[PDB]
Amino acid sequence: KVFGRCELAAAMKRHGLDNYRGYSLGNWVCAAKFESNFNTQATNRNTDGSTDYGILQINSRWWCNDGRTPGSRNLCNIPCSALLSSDITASVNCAKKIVSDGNGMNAWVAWRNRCKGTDVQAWIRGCRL
């Protein structure tokens, strides 16, 4: 599913992300924009052979099981394919663990390079929330 901007903001909000660990909703929307272009089915292979899955491009090295990432963990206790669903529940729950792990949203390299220090509120501008 390719989400609309405001549609993802609303779904993120409903699943408890707005100010989760101090990150306003615009942070999450911006991160999803540059990670996946709001497309739940986005996948990208990393140099180490791990793969990133879903709207927030959650990685198989640490966070989900794809059966093909030697020596990885599955800290969200989910198949990586659950991160591709039109239902973003699994992505959201897993992101909450990720963002709690000490580095905050800096865990998302694209958030750090494209969202951090920017006017992220612009991403929810005009949305009915």
mmCIF file of C-alpha atoms in Angstrom:
data_model
loop_
_atom_site.group_PDB
_atom_site.id
_atom_site.type_symbol
_atom_site.label_atom_id
_atom_site.label_comp_id
_atom_site.label_asym_id
_atom_site.label_seq_id
_atom_site.Cartn_x
_atom_site.Cartn_y
_atom_site.Cartn_z
ATOM 1 C CA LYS A 1 0.000 0.000 0.000
ATOM 2 C CA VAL A 2 1.267 3.451 -0.904
ATOM 3 C CA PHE A 3 -0.026 5.785 1.817
ATOM 4 C CA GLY A 4 -1.000 9.421 1.358
ATOM 5 C CA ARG A 5 0.967 11.827 3.511
ATOM 6 C CA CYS A 6 -1.889 12.801 5.826
ATOM 7 C CA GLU A 7 -3.277 9.263 5.730
ATOM 8 C CA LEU A 8 0.021 7.905 7.148
ATOM 9 C CA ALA A 9 0.209 10.693 9.718
ATOM 10 C CA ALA A 10 -3.254 9.714 10.954
ATOM 11 C CA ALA A 11 -2.414 5.988 11.036
ATOM 12 C CA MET A 12 0.907 6.746 12.848
ATOM 13 C CA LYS A 13 -0.964 8.952 15.319
ATOM 14 C CA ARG A 14 -3.573 6.270 16.012
ATOM 15 C CA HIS A 15 -0.834 3.713 16.624
ATOM 16 C CA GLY A 16 0.795 5.941 19.309
ATOM 17 C CA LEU A 17 3.835 7.457 17.477
ATOM 18 C CA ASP A 18 3.098 11.239 17.956
ATOM 19 C CA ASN A 19 5.701 12.240 20.506
ATOM 20 C CA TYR A 20 6.739 8.619 21.169
ATOM 21 C CA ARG A 21 10.055 9.063 23.032
ATOM 22 C CA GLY A 22 9.853 12.786 22.297
ATOM 23 C CA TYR A 23 9.595 12.552 18.500
ATOM 24 C CA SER A 24 6.751 14.622 17.094
ATOM 25 C CA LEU A 25 4.639 13.077 14.388
ATOM 26 C CA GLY A 26 6.358 15.023 11.598
ATOM 27 C CA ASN A 27 9.629 13.195 12.355
ATOM 28 C CA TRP A 28 8.007 9.829 11.706
ATOM 29 C CA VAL A 29 6.258 11.007 8.524
ATOM 30 C CA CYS A 30 9.507 12.554 7.142
ATOM 31 C CA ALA A 31 11.431 9.359 8.005
ATOM 32 C CA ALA A 32 8.875 7.247 6.170
ATOM 33 C CA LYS A 33 8.923 9.602 3.164
ATOM 34 C CA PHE A 34 12.686 9.206 2.628
ATOM 35 C CA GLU A 35 12.903 5.557 3.721
ATOM 36 C CA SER A 36 10.081 4.150 1.566
ATOM 37 C CA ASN A 37 8.158 6.945 -0.124
ATOM 38 C CA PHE A 38 5.219 5.839 2.040
ATOM 39 C CA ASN A 39 5.156 2.379 0.353
ATOM 40 C CA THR A 40 4.634 -0.537 2.770
ATOM 41 C CA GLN A 41 6.145 -2.984 0.246
ATOM 42 C CA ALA A 42 9.497 -1.200 -0.087
ATOM 43 C CA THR A 43 12.558 -3.511 0.248
ATOM 44 C CA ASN A 44 16.256 -2.734 -0.133
ATOM 45 C CA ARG A 45 19.229 -4.997 0.225
ATOM 46 C CA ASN A 46 22.164 -3.773 2.283
ATOM 47 C CA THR A 47 25.887 -4.251 1.566
ATOM 48 C CA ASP A 48 26.218 -6.732 4.535
ATOM 49 C CA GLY A 49 23.457 -8.933 2.944
ATOM 50 C CA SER A 50 20.790 -7.822 5.416
ATOM 51 C CA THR A 51 17.572 -6.295 3.938
ATOM 52 C CA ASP A 52 15.387 -3.310 4.960
ATOM 53 C CA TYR A 53 11.627 -3.770 5.007
ATOM 54 C CA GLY A 54 8.547 -1.602 4.910
ATOM 55 C CA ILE A 55 7.569 1.995 5.441
ATOM 56 C CA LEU A 56 10.431 2.607 7.893
ATOM 57 C CA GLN A 57 12.914 0.246 6.253
ATOM 58 C CA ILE A 58 13.503 -1.935 9.324
ATOM 59 C CA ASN A 59 16.537 -4.072 8.967
ATOM 60 C CA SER A 60 16.862 -7.967 9.175
ATOM 61 C CA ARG A 61 20.365 -7.737 10.845
ATOM 62 C CA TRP A 62 18.781 -6.905 14.179
ATOM 63 C CA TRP A 63 15.029 -6.608 14.055
ATOM 64 C CA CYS A 64 13.071 -9.171 12.009
ATOM 65 C CA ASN A 65 13.593 -12.641 10.608
ATOM 66 C CA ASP A 66 13.835 -13.138 6.811
ATOM 67 C CA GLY A 67 15.668 -16.531 6.945
ATOM 68 C CA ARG A 68 18.480 -15.197 4.870
ATOM 69 C CA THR A 69 20.591 -12.937 7.116
ATOM 70 C CA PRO A 70 23.421 -15.039 8.607
ATOM 71 C CA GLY A 71 24.168 -14.334 12.224
ATOM 72 C CA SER A 72 21.307 -11.828 12.676
ATOM 73 C CA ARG A 73 18.808 -11.275 15.429
ATOM 74 C CA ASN A 74 15.027 -10.896 15.352
ATOM 75 C CA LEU A 75 14.560 -8.425 18.243
ATOM 76 C CA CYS A 76 11.006 -7.513 17.213
ATOM 77 C CA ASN A 77 10.045 -11.237 17.077
ATOM 78 C CA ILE A 78 8.425 -11.002 13.682
ATOM 79 C CA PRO A 79 8.905 -12.200 10.148
ATOM 80 C CA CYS A 80 10.243 -9.341 8.060
ATOM 81 C CA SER A 81 7.376 -9.881 5.643
ATOM 82 C CA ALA A 82 4.960 -8.617 8.359
ATOM 83 C CA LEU A 83 6.681 -5.216 7.853
ATOM 84 C CA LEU A 84 5.324 -5.107 4.262
ATOM 85 C CA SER A 85 1.604 -5.323 5.179
ATOM 86 C CA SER A 86 -0.980 -2.614 4.466
ATOM 87 C CA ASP A 87 -1.543 -2.797 8.250
ATOM 88 C CA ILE A 88 1.385 -0.818 9.764
ATOM 89 C CA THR A 89 0.922 -2.212 13.269
ATOM 90 C CA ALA A 90 4.062 -4.425 13.101
ATOM 91 C CA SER A 91 6.208 -1.682 11.614
ATOM 92 C CA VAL A 92 5.018 0.730 14.336
ATOM 93 C CA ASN A 93 5.538 -1.652 17.261
ATOM 94 C CA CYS A 94 8.980 -2.559 15.963
ATOM 95 C CA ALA A 95 9.906 1.102 15.388
ATOM 96 C CA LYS A 96 8.947 1.819 18.999
ATOM 97 C CA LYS A 97 11.504 -0.742 20.199
ATOM 98 C CA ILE A 98 14.101 0.590 17.766
ATOM 99 C CA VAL A 99 13.686 4.217 18.826
ATOM 100 C CA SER A 100 13.894 3.143 22.511
ATOM 101 C CA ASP A 101 17.208 1.354 22.008
ATOM 102 C CA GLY A 102 19.502 4.360 22.984
ATOM 103 C CA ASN A 103 20.140 6.235 19.682
ATOM 104 C CA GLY A 104 16.650 7.512 19.207
ATOM 105 C CA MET A 105 15.678 8.208 15.603
ATOM 106 C CA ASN A 106 19.367 8.400 14.615
ATOM 107 C CA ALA A 107 18.877 4.644 14.086
ATOM 108 C CA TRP A 108 17.274 5.754 10.784
ATOM 109 C CA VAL A 109 20.173 7.127 8.704
ATOM 110 C CA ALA A 110 17.751 8.971 6.365
ATOM 111 C CA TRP A 111 16.035 10.660 9.337
ATOM 112 C CA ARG A 112 19.431 11.858 10.523
ATOM 113 C CA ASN A 113 20.494 13.095 7.085
ATOM 114 C CA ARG A 114 17.156 14.391 5.683
ATOM 115 C CA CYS A 115 14.841 15.194 8.610
ATOM 116 C CA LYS A 116 16.905 15.973 11.728
ATOM 117 C CA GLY A 117 17.205 19.785 12.152
ATOM 118 C CA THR A 118 14.536 20.524 9.496
ATOM 119 C CA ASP A 119 11.052 21.880 9.713
ATOM 120 C CA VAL A 120 9.496 18.405 10.123
ATOM 121 C CA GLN A 121 6.102 19.833 11.102
ATOM 122 C CA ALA A 122 5.655 20.667 7.445
ATOM 123 C CA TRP A 123 5.030 16.930 6.861
ATOM 124 C CA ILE A 124 1.784 17.030 8.882
ATOM 125 C CA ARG A 125 0.780 20.541 7.726
ATOM 126 C CA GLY A 126 -2.864 20.548 6.641
ATOM 127 C CA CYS A 127 -3.669 17.113 7.971
ATOM 128 C CA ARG A 128 -6.773 16.372 10.003
ATOM 129 C CA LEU A 129 -5.365 14.641 13.110
#
